[PDB]
Amino acid sequence: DYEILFSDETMNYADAGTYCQSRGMALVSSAMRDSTMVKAILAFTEVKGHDYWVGADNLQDGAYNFLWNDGVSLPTDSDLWSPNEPSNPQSWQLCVQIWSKYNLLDDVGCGGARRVICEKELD
Amino acid sequence: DYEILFSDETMNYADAGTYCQSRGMALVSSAMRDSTMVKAILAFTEVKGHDYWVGADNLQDGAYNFLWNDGVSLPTDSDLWSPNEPSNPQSWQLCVQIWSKYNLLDDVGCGGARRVICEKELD
Ligand SMILES: OC[C@H]1O[C@@H](O)[C@H](O)[C@@H](O)[C@H]1O
Ligand SMILES: OC[C@H]1O[C@@H](O)[C@H](O)[C@@H](O)[C@H]1O
Ligand SMILES: [Ca+2]
Ligand SMILES: [Ca+2]
Ligand SMILES: [Ca+2]
Numbered sequence: 001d002y003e004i005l006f007s008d009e010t011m012n013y014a015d016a017g018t019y020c021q022s023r024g025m026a027l028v029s030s031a032m033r034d035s036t037m038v039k040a041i042l043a044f045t046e047v048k049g050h051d052y053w054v055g056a057d058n059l060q061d062g063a064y065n066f067l068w069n070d071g072v073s074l075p076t077d078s079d080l081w082s083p084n085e086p087s088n089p090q091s092w093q094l095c096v097q098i099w100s101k102y103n104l105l106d107d108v109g110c111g112g113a114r115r116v117i118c119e120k121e122l123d
Numbered sequence: 124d125y126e127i128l129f130s131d132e133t134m135n136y137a138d139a140g141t142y143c144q145s146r147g148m149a150l151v152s153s154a155m156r157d158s159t160m161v162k163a164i165l166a167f168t169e170v171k172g173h174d175y176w177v178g179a180d181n182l183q184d185g186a187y188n189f190l191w192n193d194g195v196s197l198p199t200d201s202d203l204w205s206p207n208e209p210s211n212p213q214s215w216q217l218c219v220q221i222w223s224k225y226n227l228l229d230d231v232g233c234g235g236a237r238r239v240i241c242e243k244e245l246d
């Protein structure tokens with residue numbers, strides 16, 4: 001069970017994290033690994049047709065060692081990934097978004113402004 | 124533009140309003156009148172297949188004089204209403220929810236516990 005917050009305001013990856021945190025929540029992560037919840041989240045984003053940040057990145061171990069912010073791995077072969085992603089250079093600092101082109105996961109640089117999804121495990 | 128909060132915690136209508144307000148938000152209302160937003164909101168609740176409160180009731184004016192928490196009228200003949208609703212006895216205190224039966228609006232007593240949706244407009 002969760003509390004899920006969607007925000008139309010855009011910000012970079014770092015600010016997105018602090019945004020959720022200031023609200024007593026976290027950038028969406030365990031909710032994305034929950035089969036029912038992820039379906040509900042993506043139905044919303046499907047309608048909105050915009051890019052949203054998620055709480056995953058390669059900042060700690062680099063390359064395609066993606067980690068959710070709660071420390072659980074985001075497998076490179078996950079079904080959550082958009083077609084042909086992740087594909088950015090492994091030597092880059094990479095953050096994960098829900099890319100509007102496919103309404104699925106995608107690796108990008110952490111500087112662009114995107115909408116935010118926060119979570120809070122209920123409890 | 125909005126911040127939208129969905130919560131799996133269940134509460135009666137009054138607790139729902141307090142829960143939203145204590146978060147600097149309001150029980151969903153103007154976002155339900157926004158064409159893009161409402162469809163996104165309903166995509167989510169459709170997946171969840173559960174009942175949720177919305178910020179409309181007849182507490183101020185009674186009967187089928189439904190008002191959104193922000194003073195705007197919820198037309199007894201809005202396309203937002205489930206088929207054959209509103210239909211509860213007009214002498215009752217009636218509150219509005221998104222009824223899982225149709226994933227459309229419905230009038231009910233204000234005492235049953237249901238999931239919550241809060242909104243915060245963004246300028
Ligand atoms: O908008 C994001 C997209 O940017 C492209 O440059 C990149 O090749 C894609 O893999 C995807 O990340
Ligand atoms: O469960 C919700 C439903 O409850 C019924 O008793 C009522 O006839 C319907 O109009 C609807 O409000
Ligand atoms: Ca794939
Ligand atoms: Ca990419
Ligand atoms: Ca009707």
Ligand SMILES: [Ca+2]
Binds near residue numbers: 208209210211231
């Ligand atoms: Ca009814």
Ligand SMILES: [Zn+2]
Binds near residue numbers: 001034036037
């Ligand atoms: Zn779950």
Ligand SMILES: [Zn+2]
């Ligand atoms: Zn836009």
Ligand SMILES: [Zn+2]
Binds near residue numbers: 159160
């Ligand atoms: Zn709008």
Ligand SMILES: [Zn+2]
Binds near residue numbers: 008124
């Ligand atoms: Zn805008």
Ligand SMILES: [Zn+2]
Binds near residue numbers: 173
């Ligand atoms: Zn259930």
